[PDB]
C-alpha cells in the first residue's frame, strides 16, 4: 500500500496562549512524535518510536525542525507581522505509494491567504489561494540552498522507511469493533433517533451503513468518526426512524477483521 | 462560526465499577486557542491527559483530552470547553 510521512506544524508568533511552533508528525494514522517551542527536545508519541527507533533519528530530526524554523519561519516572520498574519499551518509530507512513484510536498496555509503547495520534486511553489510575495519567496528559499531541500525530500523517504519498519507492527494491528445499536432519547432535531455505534477499530478503512429492507437509508444519515485514546477509531451513525418499525432497520458493517 | 464541535463519550460501554476512559474531543474550531476541561460531578478531574493541538489535511484543528476513570452509580461526567472567551459544558449525552 501507500504510506505518507507527515509533519504538521503550527506557527503562531507572539500568540499569548500558544507557543511559537508545534510539530506533530505522523506515520500514516499514527502520531509518532511532537515538538513545540517550550519543550526544547522532541518527544515521541508511540512506545515503538521510543524503542524500535535509533537515537540517530532523533538528533537529526532535532536538526530538521531548526531548518524549517531557520530557513523559513524566520525569513517570513517579517512579512507575516506586516500582513497581520496571526498564525500559519505547515504540512510537510513525503509519500511512497505502492512504490510506483514518490511525492514529497510542503504546504503552508497562511491564515487568511490560501495555501502555498510547494512540490519538492520539481522544486516549484504554486499559489492555491491569494497570490503574494510569499509563494515565490519560498520557491527561492528552496531553489537556493539545495542542501536544505535534501532534508525535506530524500531524508524524508529514508526516515519513512526507518519509521515504517519500526511501526510496521503498530500500523498492522487489527482492533475489532463492537457494533452496538441504541435508540437515542427523542432529541430536538430527530423525533426517534437510531444510533449505530462502532467502537475500537484500528484500520481506519471501514464500510458501514444503515439499511431498511436491504435498501440503504440515506435520508437522515448523520455520520461521525472520532478518535479513541489508544490509536483506534470510533464511528457513530444516526438516523431518524420517523416512527417506522425499528426492527426493519439494520447496520451492516464491514471492517477488515 | 469557527465554533468547536465537541463530543463527550466513553471508550467502551459504561459498566459500573469497571474501568473505562472518558473522552472529550473538539474539532473544527477557527481560533486555535482552546481549553478542554474534563468534569466529574461538576469538578475538574485531575491528571487528565491531552493530545497535542494539530489539524487534519483540511487544516481544521483538533484537540482531545481524556482520562481513565471508573464509572460509578450516581456519578456524572462532562466537559468544559473554553473557546474564544466562552465556556460551554457538554455532558456525556
Ligand atoms: C497520572 O496517570 C499516570 C498514568 O501513567 C499514573 O501512573 C500516575 O500515578 C497519575 N498521577 C500523577 C501523575 O500525579
Short mmCIF file of C-alpha atoms and ligand atoms in Angstrom, two decimals:
data_model
loop_
_atom_site.label_atom_id
_atom_site.label_comp_id
_atom_site.label_asym_id
_atom_site.label_seq_id
_atom_site.Cartn_x
_atom_site.Cartn_y
_atom_site.Cartn_z
CA UNK A 1 0.00 0.00 0.00
CA UNK A 2 0.80 3.73 0.09
CA UNK A 3 2.49 5.30 3.12
CA UNK A 4 2.88 9.00 3.98
CA UNK A 5 5.27 10.63 6.49
CA UNK A 6 3.65 13.90 7.65
CA UNK A 7 4.93 16.65 9.93
CA UNK A 8 2.15 19.09 10.92
CA UNK A 9 3.46 22.44 12.09
CA UNK A 10 1.62 25.37 13.66
CA UNK A 11 3.35 28.76 13.63
CA UNK A 12 1.85 31.43 15.89
CA UNK A 13 4.35 34.19 16.66
CA UNK A 14 3.59 36.47 19.58
CA UNK A 15 0.46 34.39 20.29
CA UNK A 16 -0.22 34.76 24.03
CA UNK A 17 -1.86 31.34 24.56
CA UNK A 18 0.06 29.22 22.02
CA UNK A 19 3.85 28.77 21.72
CA UNK A 20 5.71 29.77 18.59
CA UNK A 21 5.93 26.36 16.91
CA UNK A 22 4.21 22.95 17.28
CA UNK A 23 5.31 19.98 15.24
CA UNK A 24 3.24 16.72 15.44
CA UNK A 25 4.20 14.33 12.66
CA UNK A 26 2.51 11.01 11.98
CA UNK A 27 3.37 7.74 10.22
CA UNK A 28 0.01 7.49 8.49
CA UNK A 29 -2.64 7.21 11.28
CA UNK A 30 -0.05 7.04 13.96
CA UNK A 31 1.16 10.20 15.52
CA UNK A 32 4.83 9.42 16.07
CA UNK A 33 6.33 12.48 17.75
CA UNK A 34 5.77 16.01 18.97
CA UNK A 35 7.78 19.20 19.43
CA UNK A 36 6.97 22.77 20.49
CA UNK A 37 8.95 25.86 21.48
CA UNK A 38 8.61 25.33 25.24
CA UNK A 39 9.77 21.71 25.33
CA UNK A 40 13.31 22.14 23.89
CA UNK A 41 13.59 18.49 22.63
CA UNK A 42 11.29 16.29 20.54
CA UNK A 43 9.14 13.77 22.35
CA UNK A 44 7.85 10.53 20.84
CA UNK A 45 4.22 9.60 20.87
CA UNK A 46 4.37 5.87 20.43
CA UNK A 47 6.25 3.37 22.58
CA UNK A 48 7.72 1.77 19.45
CA UNK A 49 9.01 5.18 18.39
CA UNK A 50 10.76 5.25 21.72
CA UNK A 51 12.18 1.72 21.39
CA UNK A 52 12.43 0.36 17.83
CA UNK A 53 13.96 3.64 16.67
CA UNK A 54 17.63 4.60 16.57
CA UNK A 55 18.76 7.55 18.58
CA UNK A 56 20.48 8.91 15.46
CA UNK A 57 16.99 9.54 14.15
CA UNK A 58 16.23 12.00 16.96
CA UNK A 59 19.41 14.13 16.79
CA UNK A 60 18.72 14.67 13.11
CA UNK A 61 15.00 15.14 13.46
CA UNK A 62 16.05 17.70 16.09
CA UNK A 63 18.16 19.49 13.49
CA UNK A 64 15.33 19.26 10.95
CA UNK A 65 12.92 21.46 12.92
CA UNK A 66 15.62 24.14 13.12
CA UNK A 67 15.89 24.09 9.32
CA UNK A 68 12.21 24.79 8.80
CA UNK A 69 12.44 27.31 11.58
CA UNK A 70 15.61 28.96 10.35
CA UNK A 71 15.25 28.68 6.60
CA UNK A 72 11.53 29.62 6.51
CA UNK A 73 9.72 30.84 9.62
CA UNK A 74 12.44 33.36 10.39
CA UNK A 75 12.62 34.72 6.84
CA UNK A 76 8.89 35.37 6.51
CA UNK A 77 8.22 36.36 10.10
CA UNK A 78 8.83 39.99 8.96
CA UNK A 79 6.22 39.57 6.28
CA UNK A 80 3.54 37.97 8.45
CA UNK A 81 3.85 40.74 11.04
CA UNK A 82 3.22 43.24 8.19
CA UNK A 83 0.15 41.39 6.94
CA UNK A 84 -1.23 40.96 10.44
CA UNK A 85 -0.98 37.20 9.93
CA UNK A 86 -1.90 35.56 13.21
CA UNK A 87 -0.71 32.00 12.56
CA UNK A 88 0.40 29.63 9.76
CA UNK A 89 -0.24 25.93 9.30
CA UNK A 90 2.57 23.98 7.64
CA UNK A 91 2.22 20.40 6.37
CA UNK A 92 5.47 18.73 5.25
CA UNK A 93 4.97 15.23 3.89
CA UNK A 94 6.53 12.58 1.72
CA UNK A 95 4.60 9.59 0.45
CA UNK A 96 5.69 6.27 -1.11
CA UNK A 97 2.61 4.86 -2.87
CA UNK A 98 2.69 1.13 -3.86
CA UNK A 99 6.31 2.09 -4.72
CA UNK A 100 5.07 3.36 -8.12
CA UNK A 101 6.26 6.96 -7.75
CA UNK A 102 7.23 9.22 -4.87
CA UNK A 103 5.73 12.58 -3.90
CA UNK A 104 7.17 14.89 -1.30
CA UNK A 105 5.25 18.22 -0.92
CA UNK A 106 5.30 21.10 1.59
CA UNK A 107 2.14 23.16 2.09
CA UNK A 108 1.56 26.35 4.04
CA UNK A 109 -1.87 27.58 4.94
CA UNK A 110 -1.17 31.19 5.64
CA UNK A 111 -4.12 32.25 7.68
CA UNK A 112 -6.44 34.40 5.55
CA UNK A 113 -4.50 33.93 2.34
CA UNK A 114 -4.65 30.48 0.72
CA UNK A 115 -2.17 27.58 0.80
CA UNK A 116 1.30 27.50 -0.87
CA UNK A 117 1.62 24.00 -2.41
CA UNK A 118 5.40 23.59 -2.81
CA UNK A 119 6.24 20.46 -4.85
CA UNK A 120 9.69 19.30 -3.77
CA UNK A 121 10.45 17.08 -6.73
CA UNK A 122 10.00 19.94 -9.28
CA UNK A 123 11.15 22.49 -6.66
CA UNK A 124 8.39 24.99 -7.64
CA UNK A 125 5.74 26.58 -5.34
CA UNK A 126 2.25 27.41 -6.58
CA UNK A 127 -0.41 29.58 -5.03
CA UNK A 128 -3.52 27.68 -4.10
CA UNK A 129 -5.16 30.88 -2.69
CA UNK A 130 -4.37 34.61 -2.51
CA UNK A 131 -1.24 35.46 -4.53
CA UNK A 132 1.54 37.30 -2.73
CA UNK A 133 5.34 37.62 -2.42
CA UNK A 134 5.29 34.53 -0.23
CA UNK A 135 4.59 31.95 -2.97
CA UNK A 136 7.84 32.74 -4.75
CA UNK A 137 9.76 33.83 -1.63
CA UNK A 138 9.74 30.24 -0.52
CA UNK A 139 10.37 28.91 -4.02
CA UNK A 140 13.59 30.89 -3.83
CA UNK A 141 14.38 29.61 -0.34
CA UNK A 142 14.13 26.14 -1.80
CA UNK A 143 15.87 26.87 -5.08
CA UNK A 144 18.93 28.23 -3.34
CA UNK A 145 20.44 26.13 -0.58
CA UNK A 146 19.81 22.69 -2.13
CA UNK A 147 21.25 21.04 0.96
CA UNK A 148 18.09 22.05 2.85
CA UNK A 149 15.76 20.52 0.30
CA UNK A 150 17.95 17.42 0.85
CA UNK A 151 16.39 17.20 4.32
CA UNK A 152 12.80 17.61 3.10
CA UNK A 153 12.75 15.29 0.14
CA UNK A 154 15.32 12.44 0.29
CA UNK A 155 15.86 12.04 4.06
CA UNK A 156 12.09 12.23 4.34
CA UNK A 157 11.67 8.93 2.48
CA UNK A 158 14.59 7.17 4.23
CA UNK A 159 13.14 8.32 7.54
CA UNK A 160 9.85 6.97 6.24
CA UNK A 161 11.40 3.53 5.70
CA UNK A 162 13.05 3.64 9.11
CA UNK A 163 9.88 4.53 10.97
CA UNK A 164 7.81 2.41 8.59
CA UNK A 165 9.88 -0.55 9.75
CA UNK A 166 9.72 0.41 13.43
CA UNK A 167 5.96 0.90 13.17
CA UNK A 168 5.08 -1.97 10.85
CA UNK A 169 3.67 -3.91 13.87
CA UNK A 170 1.55 -0.93 15.01
CA UNK A 171 0.22 0.04 11.54
CA UNK A 172 -0.77 -3.59 11.03
CA UNK A 173 -2.63 -4.21 14.33
CA UNK A 174 -6.34 -5.04 13.86
CA UNK A 175 -8.55 -3.83 16.76
CA UNK A 176 -12.02 -5.34 16.24
CA UNK A 177 -15.06 -3.02 16.67
CA UNK A 178 -18.18 -3.75 18.64
CA UNK A 179 -21.30 -2.84 16.69
CA UNK A 180 -23.92 -1.52 19.13
CA UNK A 181 -27.35 -0.09 18.29
CA UNK A 182 -29.13 2.30 20.65
CA UNK A 183 -32.38 4.15 20.39
CA UNK A 184 -31.33 7.67 21.47
CA UNK A 185 -33.72 9.84 23.53
CA UNK A 186 -36.01 11.95 21.36
CA UNK A 187 -33.86 14.99 20.63
CA UNK A 188 -34.85 18.38 19.22
CA UNK A 189 -33.79 17.63 15.63
CA UNK A 190 -34.83 13.98 15.14
CA UNK A 191 -38.01 12.63 16.73
CA UNK A 192 -36.89 8.99 17.14
CA UNK A 193 -33.11 8.64 16.71
CA UNK A 194 -31.35 5.36 15.97
CA UNK A 195 -27.59 5.25 16.61
CA UNK A 196 -25.23 2.55 15.35
CA UNK A 197 -22.08 2.70 17.48
CA UNK A 198 -18.90 1.08 16.17
CA UNK A 199 -16.01 1.49 18.59
CA UNK A 200 -12.44 0.28 18.82
CA UNK A 201 -11.47 -0.41 15.20
CA UNK A 202 -7.84 0.17 14.16
CA UNK A 203 -7.68 0.02 10.36
CA UNK A 204 -9.48 3.26 9.65
CA UNK A 205 -10.79 1.82 6.39
CA UNK A 206 -14.30 0.69 7.11
CA UNK A 207 -17.65 0.37 5.35
CA UNK A 208 -20.85 0.66 7.42
CA UNK A 209 -24.39 1.84 6.67
CA UNK A 210 -27.96 1.59 7.81
CA UNK A 211 -30.38 -0.42 5.66
CA UNK A 212 -34.20 -0.74 5.68
CA UNK A 213 -35.49 -3.81 3.77
CA UNK A 214 -31.92 -4.04 2.41
CA UNK A 215 -32.49 -0.65 0.74
CA UNK A 216 -29.85 1.80 2.17
CA UNK A 217 -31.50 4.52 4.23
CA UNK A 218 -29.67 7.79 3.44
CA UNK A 219 -32.34 10.33 4.41
CA UNK A 220 -31.35 11.45 7.91
CA UNK A 221 -27.86 9.98 7.87
CA UNK A 222 -25.51 11.63 10.36
CA UNK A 223 -22.02 10.17 10.37
CA UNK A 224 -19.23 10.89 12.83
CA UNK A 225 -15.78 9.36 13.19
CA UNK A 226 -13.99 10.25 16.40
CA UNK A 227 -10.52 9.29 17.63
CA UNK A 228 -10.11 6.93 20.61
CA UNK A 229 -7.26 7.20 23.05
CA UNK A 230 -5.19 4.17 22.02
CA UNK A 231 -4.92 4.99 18.30
CA UNK A 232 -8.12 3.27 17.28
CA UNK A 233 -11.30 4.82 15.97
CA UNK A 234 -14.92 5.37 16.84
CA UNK A 235 -17.88 5.64 14.43
CA UNK A 236 -21.49 6.74 15.06
CA UNK A 237 -24.33 6.62 12.54
CA UNK A 238 -27.61 8.30 13.40
CA UNK A 239 -30.98 8.15 11.66
CA UNK A 240 -34.43 9.46 12.49
CA UNK A 241 -36.62 6.36 12.12
CA UNK A 242 -39.60 8.77 11.98
CA UNK A 243 -41.91 6.24 13.64
CA UNK A 244 -41.07 3.32 11.37
CA UNK A 245 -40.69 -0.11 13.00
CA UNK A 246 -37.03 -0.22 14.14
CA UNK A 247 -36.87 -4.00 13.73
CA UNK A 248 -36.83 -3.34 9.95
CA UNK A 249 -33.51 -1.41 10.19
CA UNK A 250 -30.02 -2.90 10.23
CA UNK A 251 -26.49 -1.59 10.49
CA UNK A 252 -24.24 -3.54 8.12
CA UNK A 253 -20.53 -3.08 8.98
CA UNK A 254 -17.53 -4.40 7.01
CA UNK A 255 -14.18 -3.94 8.74
CA UNK A 256 -11.07 -5.80 7.53
CA UNK A 257 -11.22 -8.04 10.63
CA UNK B 1 -18.84 30.41 13.36
CA UNK B 2 -15.42 28.75 13.92
CA UNK B 3 -17.18 27.32 16.98
CA UNK B 4 -15.97 23.89 18.19
CA UNK B 5 -17.77 20.69 17.51
CA UNK B 6 -17.36 18.85 20.81
CA UNK B 7 -18.23 15.27 21.63
CA UNK B 8 -18.02 13.76 25.08
CA UNK B 9 -18.04 9.95 25.06
CA UNK B 10 -16.71 6.81 26.76
CA UNK B 11 -14.21 4.38 25.14
CA UNK B 12 -16.30 1.29 25.94
CA UNK B 13 -19.87 0.98 27.22
CA UNK B 14 -20.30 2.15 30.81
CA UNK B 15 -20.21 -0.84 33.13
CA UNK B 16 -20.36 0.46 36.66
CA UNK B 17 -17.28 -0.18 38.71
CA UNK B 18 -15.47 -1.33 35.54
CA UNK B 19 -12.57 0.81 34.34
CA UNK B 20 -13.05 2.93 31.24
CA UNK B 21 -11.80 6.05 29.51
CA UNK B 22 -13.66 9.41 29.39
CA UNK B 23 -13.16 11.34 26.17
CA UNK B 24 -13.76 14.93 25.16
CA UNK B 25 -12.94 15.74 21.61
CA UNK B 26 -13.17 19.11 19.86
CA UNK B 27 -12.53 19.75 16.17
CA UNK B 28 -13.34 22.35 13.51
CA UNK B 29 -12.57 25.45 15.61
CA UNK B 30 -11.19 28.57 13.94
CA UNK B 31 -9.11 30.42 16.54
CA UNK B 32 -6.81 27.51 17.54
CA UNK B 33 -6.56 28.56 21.18
CA UNK B 34 -8.96 26.33 23.09
CA UNK B 35 -9.33 24.97 26.61
CA UNK B 36 -10.72 21.49 27.35
CA UNK B 37 -11.60 20.59 30.98
CA UNK B 38 -12.89 17.15 31.99
CA UNK B 39 -15.55 17.38 34.71
CA UNK B 40 -16.52 14.74 37.25
CA UNK B 41 -19.59 15.78 39.14
CA UNK B 42 -19.01 19.43 38.28
CA UNK B 43 -15.39 19.22 39.50
CA UNK B 44 -12.26 19.31 37.36
CA UNK B 45 -10.77 15.84 37.00
CA UNK B 46 -7.00 15.91 37.67
CA UNK B 47 -4.19 14.04 35.93
CA UNK B 48 -6.16 14.14 32.70
CA UNK B 49 -4.08 13.80 29.52
CA UNK B 50 -4.48 15.92 26.41
CA UNK B 51 -3.45 15.14 22.87
CA UNK B 52 -1.45 17.83 21.11
CA UNK B 53 -3.11 20.61 19.14
CA UNK B 54 -2.94 19.65 15.49
CA UNK B 55 -5.08 19.51 12.37
CA UNK B 56 -6.39 17.45 9.50
CA UNK B 57 -5.33 17.68 5.85
CA UNK B 58 -8.25 20.15 5.51
CA UNK B 59 -6.44 22.46 8.00
CA UNK B 60 -9.22 22.05 10.62
CA UNK B 61 -7.74 21.88 14.11
CA UNK B 62 -8.19 19.12 16.67
CA UNK B 63 -7.86 18.54 20.38
CA UNK B 64 -8.65 15.53 22.58
CA UNK B 65 -8.39 15.46 26.39
CA UNK B 66 -9.01 12.08 28.03
CA UNK B 67 -8.64 10.24 31.34
CA UNK B 68 -9.07 6.71 32.79
CA UNK B 69 -11.94 6.76 35.24
CA UNK B 70 -14.24 4.16 36.75
CA UNK B 71 -17.94 4.82 36.15
CA UNK B 72 -19.90 4.58 39.43
CA UNK B 73 -23.61 4.69 40.05
CA UNK B 74 -24.64 8.25 40.95
CA UNK B 75 -21.56 9.66 39.19
CA UNK B 76 -21.79 12.20 36.34
CA UNK B 77 -19.13 13.34 33.79
CA UNK B 78 -18.87 16.28 31.42
CA UNK B 79 -16.54 18.65 29.57
CA UNK B 80 -15.96 22.37 29.92
CA UNK B 81 -14.84 23.76 26.55
CA UNK B 82 -13.45 27.25 26.86
CA UNK B 83 -13.09 28.58 23.36
CA UNK B 84 -12.68 32.20 22.42
CA UNK B 85 -13.69 33.62 25.79
CA UNK B 86 -16.68 31.24 26.26
CA UNK B 87 -17.02 28.12 28.36
CA UNK B 88 -19.57 25.55 27.27
CA UNK B 89 -20.33 22.37 29.15
CA UNK B 90 -21.16 19.19 27.34
CA UNK B 91 -22.41 16.23 29.40
CA UNK B 92 -21.78 12.62 28.26
CA UNK B 93 -25.07 12.58 26.31
C1 LIG C 1 -1.35 10.05 36.40
O1 LIG C 1 -1.52 8.91 35.47
C2 LIG C 1 -0.40 8.02 35.47
C3 LIG C 1 -0.57 7.07 34.31
O2 LIG C 1 0.70 6.72 33.77
C4 LIG C 1 -0.32 7.36 36.84
O3 LIG C 1 0.54 6.22 36.88
C5 LIG C 1 0.05 8.43 37.85
O4 LIG C 1 0.20 7.83 39.13
C6 LIG C 1 -1.04 9.53 37.84
N1 LIG C 1 -0.80 10.60 38.81
C7 LIG C 1 0.00 11.70 38.73
C8 LIG C 1 0.91 11.83 37.53
O5 LIG C 1 0.03 12.54 39.64
#
